[PDB]
Amino acid sequence: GAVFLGFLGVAGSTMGAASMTLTVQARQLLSGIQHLLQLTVWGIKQLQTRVLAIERYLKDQQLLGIWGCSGKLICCTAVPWNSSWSNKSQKEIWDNMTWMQWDKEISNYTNTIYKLLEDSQNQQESNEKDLLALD
Amino acid sequence: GAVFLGFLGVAGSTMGAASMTLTVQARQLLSGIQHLLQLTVWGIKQLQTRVLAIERYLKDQQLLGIWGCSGKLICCTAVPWNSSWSNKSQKEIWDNMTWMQWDKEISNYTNTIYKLLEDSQNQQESNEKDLLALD
Amino acid sequence: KKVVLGKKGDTVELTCTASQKKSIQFHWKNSNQIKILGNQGSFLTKGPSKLNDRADSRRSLWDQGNFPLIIKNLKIEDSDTYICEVEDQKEEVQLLVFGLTANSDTHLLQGQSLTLTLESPPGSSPSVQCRSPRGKNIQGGKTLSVSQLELQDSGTWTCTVLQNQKKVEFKIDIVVL
Amino acid sequence: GNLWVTVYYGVPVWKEATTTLFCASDAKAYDTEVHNVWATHACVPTDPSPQELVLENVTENFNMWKNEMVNQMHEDVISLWDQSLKPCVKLTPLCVTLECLINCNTSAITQACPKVSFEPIPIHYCTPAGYAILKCNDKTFNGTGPCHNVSTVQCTHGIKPVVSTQLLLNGSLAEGEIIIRSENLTNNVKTILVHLNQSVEIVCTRPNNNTRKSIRIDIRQAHCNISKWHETLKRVSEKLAEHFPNKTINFTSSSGGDLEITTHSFTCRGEFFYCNTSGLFNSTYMPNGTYLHSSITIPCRIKQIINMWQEVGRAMYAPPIEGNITCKSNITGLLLVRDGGTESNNTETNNGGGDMRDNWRSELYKYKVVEIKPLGVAPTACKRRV
Numbered sequence: 001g002a003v004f005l006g007f008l009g010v011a012g013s014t015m016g017a018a019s020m021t022l023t024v025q026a027r028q029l030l031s032g033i034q035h036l037l038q039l040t041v042w043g044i045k046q047l048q049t050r051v052l053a054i055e056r057y058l059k060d061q062q063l064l065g066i067w068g069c070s071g072k073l074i075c076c077t078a079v080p081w082n083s084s085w086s087n088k089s090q091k092e093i094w095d096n097m098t099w100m101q102w103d104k105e106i107s108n109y110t111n112t113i114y115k116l117l118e119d120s121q122n123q124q125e126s127n128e129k130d131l132l133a134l135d
Numbered sequence: 136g137a138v139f140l141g142f143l144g145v146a147g148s149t150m151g152a153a154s155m156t157l158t159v160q161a162r163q164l165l166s167g168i169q170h171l172l173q174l175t176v177w178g179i180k181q182l183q184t185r186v187l188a189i190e191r192y193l194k195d196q197q198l199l200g201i202w203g204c205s206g207k208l209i210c211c212t213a214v215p216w217n218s219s220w221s222n223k224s225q226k227e228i229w230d231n232m233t234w235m236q237w238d239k240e241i242s243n244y245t246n247t248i249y250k251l252l253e254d255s256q257n258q259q260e261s262n263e264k265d266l267l268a269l270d
Numbered sequence: 271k272k273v274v275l276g277k278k279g280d281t282v283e284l285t286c287t288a289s290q291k292k293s294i295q296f297h298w299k300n301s302n303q304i305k306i307l308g309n310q311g312s313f314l315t316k317g318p319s320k321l322n323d324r325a326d327s328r329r330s331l332w333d334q335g336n337f338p339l340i341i342k343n344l345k346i347e348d349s350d351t352y353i354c355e356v357e358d359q360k361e362e363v364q365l366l367v368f369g370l371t372a373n374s375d376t377h378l379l380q381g382q383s384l385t386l387t388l389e390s391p392p393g394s395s396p397s398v399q400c401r402s403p404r405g406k407n408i409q410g411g412k413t414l415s416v417s418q419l420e421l422q423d424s425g426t427w428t429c430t431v432l433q434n435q436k437k438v439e440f441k442i443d444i445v446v447l
Numbered sequence: 448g449n450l451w452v453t454v455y456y457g458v459p460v461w462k463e464a465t466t467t468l469f470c471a472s473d474a475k476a477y478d479t480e481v482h483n484v485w486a487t488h489a490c491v492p493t494d495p496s497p498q499e500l501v502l503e504n505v506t507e508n509f510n511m512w513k514n515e516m517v518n519q520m521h522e523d524v525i526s527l528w529d530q531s532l533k534p535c536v537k538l539t540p541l542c543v544t545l546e547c548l549i550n551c552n553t554s555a556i557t558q559a560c561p562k563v564s565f566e567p568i569p570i571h572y573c574t575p576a577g578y579a580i581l582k583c584n585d586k587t588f589n590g591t592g593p594c595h596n597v598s599t600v601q602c603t604h605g606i607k608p609v610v611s612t613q614l615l616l617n618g619s620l621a622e623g624e625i626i627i628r629s630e631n632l633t634n635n636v637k638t639i640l641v642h643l644n645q646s647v648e649i650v651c652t653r654p655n656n657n658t659r660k661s662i663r664i665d666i667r668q669a670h671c672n673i674s675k676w677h678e679t680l681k682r683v684s685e686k687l688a689e690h691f692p693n694k695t696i697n698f699t700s701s702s703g704g705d706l707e708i709t710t711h712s713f714t715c716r717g718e719f720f721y722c723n724t725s726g727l728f729n730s731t732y733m734p735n736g737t738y739l740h741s742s743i744t745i746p747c748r749i750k751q752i753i754n755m756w757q758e759v760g761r762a763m764y765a766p767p768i769e770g771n772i773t774c775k776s777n778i779t780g781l782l783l784v785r786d787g788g789t790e791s792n793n794t795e796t797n798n799g800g801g802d803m804r805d806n807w808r809s810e811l812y813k814y815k816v817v818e819i820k821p822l823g824v825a826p827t828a829c830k831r832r833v
């Protein structure tokens with residue numbers, strides 16, 4: 001995906017391609033089985049990138065936290081979809097609109113989904129207490 | 136919070152303030168939408184800090200592991216509180232004792248809570264097996 | 271190419287075509303492409319230009335596919351090519367707005383003289399054909415003058431200036447006493 | 448039945464942003480050539496693993512005028528040029544707002560101005576993390592059109608630091624063929640750009656040959672014995688006609704003014720070679736050109752008091768070197784706009800370019816920087832326990 005990250009697919013490959021290259025990125029990195037006096041500064045600048053990679057990586061890989069699947073690579077949410085948002089089915093979905101040209105179709109619900117998602121997380125917290133109010 | 140970390144609130148702001156600045160730290164970093172020949176050594180010393188930030192970050196951000204919520208930013212445990220520990224309710228709690236002067240009130244239960252928490256984690260493991268002993 | 275002209279005090283109109291006739295995304299942007307006026311869906315992005323205070327458009331017309339752009343209270347600096355990029359083409363208006371005045375302000379006498387000043391914007395090769403109540407066709411370039419100014423010259427003077435295929439009329443007011 | 452939502456991570460979705468990018472630039476860190484000096488001081492030796500993981504059937508509108516990555520390269524270059532090039536006495540202008548006396552008083556600024564060198568570096572642009580530099584194997588676009596068989600990179604390809612007007616030097620070339628870049632045919636400023644799919648020879652020599660400097664109380668006289676070329680201009684005209692169909696094809700008017708927009712202005716010895724509109728600017732096209740017919744001749748000579756492509760205002764450079772210079776090149780294309788209007792009857796003429804933001808955009812129509820939006824939304828039938 002051109003960088004240490006974006007590592008769950010290749011551009012132009014439509015959705016299903018990237019979605020499945022998830023597991024093969026896993027399975028491919030699972031087993032593991034001249035230098036100038038001022039190369040210093042290149043190494044240096046080389047450093048940041050990797051850190052920042054992990055940093056952002058977490059930074060929302062973290063805040064998949066309030067989204068209920070931090071750390072991992074694959075959510076499934078619990079919200080009712082609004083056909084007003086995309087109105088498409090997996091067939092054309094995964095095989096077409098090579099994502100970069102996919103999400104622009106929904107460039108606006110970008111935060112409405114975060115809305116509904118954290119909302120259902122709080123929904124779960126509410127039902128956990130409802131269920132615990134007796135035992 | 137004065138550093139790359141401690142990033143879920145501001146000092147003097149009592150609890151509720153920091154607790155809610157959690158989510159806005161999330162929402163604020165979500166979208167993203169002279170140099171001397173021996174500046175080398177400052178960059179160098181600048182480096183460590185960031186690594187160590189992530190390092191400690193994980194290092195127990197990791198060992199929220201045995202605490203059952205590693206990686207994330209917000210736990211809710213499963214233990215029965217000892218009114219002997221603080222005997223306060225969210226109202227004054229979150230609005231007062233600007234934490235730095237909050238936890239000193241409980242400077243001793245520091246490890247009793249880790250005790251009970253990892254204890255309830257093992258409690259869950261025990262109930263998982265009890266429940267699985269039939270199917 | 272399709273020009274427009276102004277009068278240093280007027281407005282002007284600038285046109286944008288669209289075949290879907292549907293209010294699709296247009297943006298108005300000057301020569302080196304600052305954003306000036308833009309349809310963002312059903313909205314107008316007052317761009318970050320010299321014209322954050324002036325420009326506008328008839329808004330209703332968009333759902334027809336005709337997107338306009340006006341430059342109210344033109345001063346010689348609003349004189350610049352523009353561009354409209356509705357779907358796949360970038361229609362360019364070109365606005366070369368000026369104004370004009372005379373030297374005399376309130377006081378003149380009979381047999382005296384008066385002169386002219388036309389505040390053209392850079393890059394213009396106009397020609398000032400100027401008139402009088404007495405039929406004084408002052409034939410020349412910028413600085414039009416006459417050594418004879420009389421009581422019969424009273425009344426304003428229909429002055430005009432040709433800047434690349436067009437002109438626009440002008441007062442030169444004449445009052446005595 | 449009903450519809451519910453899923454969202455998940457990491458699903459390459461790269462909406463727009465145009466933020467900072469870092470260079471990949473293999474300097475030598477030894478040569479006094481200021482190109483590499485900057486290319487190491489503020490730029491970094493190269494990245495050895497670029498992975499153009501080619502796109503499948505994308506449809507993305509690599510709109511070449513909403514790519515602030517190009518502005519970023521621009522400002523990087525303007526940053527480069529000034530510690531690179533040393534104006535002896537820069538007479539730059541200023542005024543502070545006073546409605547009409549805006550105080551435009553000439554601000555003279557003195558400095559020190561010796562020579563160093565000039566030799567481009569194919570630098571490349573490198574997305575930050577979560578960012579991806581879409582490339583484009585197709586180059587046509589009309590100006591704004593996608594590409595099947597390209598995709599992402601890690602750092603970009605070489606985009607060199609020489610600057611020139613309508614015609615470059617020591618620079619890029621064109622990949623497949625010659626294509627063009629513009630929009631509406633109502634008034635037509637909309638500068639047009641062509642990338643010319645072959646090379647050309649341009650070479651200027653002057654050993655000494657002119658020891659006598661002045662003429663009255665010539666060394667600045669440079670004679671560029673070039674080549675002869677013409678057939679690339681025939682390809683020029685045939686393209687032009689393919690977009691300007693029913694009219695002949697001239698140039699017919701190089702009005703003039705400030706030397707840098709008209710004359711071939713290009714950087715060598717840090718300085719440039721300034722002639723009139725006499726050369727190669729003339730031919731008409733109805734089904735034949737209009738010129739004529741090794742290093743033979745063309746007279747473009749050097750000045751010293753230049754204008755800046757960077758920020759308005761003059762500059763004052765040094766007396767030149769004794770002689771024995773040479774510069775070759777590989778023209779990638781050309782920079783043109785119709786000398787248009789409404790006085791015209793069926794002859795057509797193109798005419799010129801001095802805005803860098805395209806001068807280095809016949810090389811970046813591909814590059815569209817994007818973040819990742821690896822959080823994605825989709826429908827399922829997924830909902831929780833009640």
Ligand SMILES: *[C@@H]1O[C@H](CO)[C@@H](O)[C@H](O)[C@H]1NC(C)=O
Nearest residue numbers: 080081082083084085112450
């Ligand atoms: C989504 O659909 C539900 C019912 O199906 C409705 O209540 C809700 O308003 C819709 N939201 C949007 C953004 O369309």
Ligand SMILES: *[C@@H]1O[C@H](CO)[C@@H](O)[C@H](O)[C@H]1NC(C)=O
Nearest residue numbers: 082083084086087088089450
């Ligand atoms: C939207 O979804 C409904 C589902 O019944 C379908 O009938 C309709 O054709 C869809 N329309 C569009 C524009 O996708």
Ligand SMILES: *[C@@H]1O[C@H](CO)[C@@H](O)[C@H](O)[C@H]1NC(C)=O
Nearest residue numbers: 090091092093094095096097
């Ligand atoms: C994707 O789009 C192409 C053309 O629009 C179509 O031929 C193909 O069937 C689509 N994919 C699916 C799974 O329908």
Ligand SMILES: *[C@@H]1O[C@H](CO)[C@@H](O)[C@H](O)[C@H]1NC(C)=O
Nearest residue numbers: 013014017094095096503504
């Ligand atoms: C896109 O079209 C190419 C054409 O060869 C095809 O191989 C590919 O399967 C298509 N995309 C998907 C997701 O199938």
Ligand SMILES: *[C@@H]1O[C@H](CO)[C@@H](O)[C@H](O)[C@H]1NC(C)=O
Nearest residue numbers: 105106107108109310311312
């Ligand atoms: C959907 O997103 C686009 C992105 O620009 C926005 O213009 C549009 O207004 C959004 N939809 C609605 C109904 O506002």
Ligand SMILES: *[C@@H]1O[C@H](CO)[C@@H](O)[C@H](O)[C@H]1NC(C)=O
Nearest residue numbers: 147148149150152230231233
């Ligand atoms: C601290 O006191 C200030 C008064 O200066 C008040 O504005 C602020 O709310 C107090 N802190 C908190 C966390 O409430």
Ligand SMILES: *[C@@H]1O[C@H](CO)[C@@H](O)[C@H](O)[C@H]1NC(C)=O
Nearest residue numbers: 214215216217218219220247
């Ligand atoms: C904590 O509470 C539990 C029951 O609520 C009690 O059995 C235990 O002794 C208490 N311990 C302390 C230290 O208060």
Ligand SMILES: *[C@@H]1O[C@H](CO)[C@@H](O)[C@H](O)[C@H]1NC(C)=O
Nearest residue numbers: 217218219220221222223224
């Ligand atoms: C301790 O908790 C009890 C519980 O009812 C409360 O009544 C009492 O005020 C609390 N005391 C302190 C010092 O917090």
Ligand SMILES: *[C@@H]1O[C@H](CO)[C@@H](O)[C@H](O)[C@H]1NC(C)=O
Nearest residue numbers: 225226227228229230231232
């Ligand atoms: C915190 O303490 C101050 C002073 O003791 C009081 O005014 C304030 O109301 C307290 N906070 C709450 C939530 O009661």
Ligand SMILES: *[C@@H]1O[C@H](CO)[C@@H](O)[C@H](O)[C@H]1NC(C)=O
Nearest residue numbers: 219239240241242243244245
């Ligand atoms: C609570 O912590 C304080 C810290 O100084 C300590 O002195 C005290 O002994 C602890 N509480 C008990 C009951 O020991």
Ligand SMILES: *[C@@H]1O[C@H](CO)[C@@H](O)[C@H](O)[C@H]1NC(C)=O
Nearest residue numbers: 688689690691692693694793
């Ligand atoms: C104008 O061009 C068309 C082709 O686009 C050609 O068929 C036609 O003959 C031309 N006009 C004349 C007078 O030949």
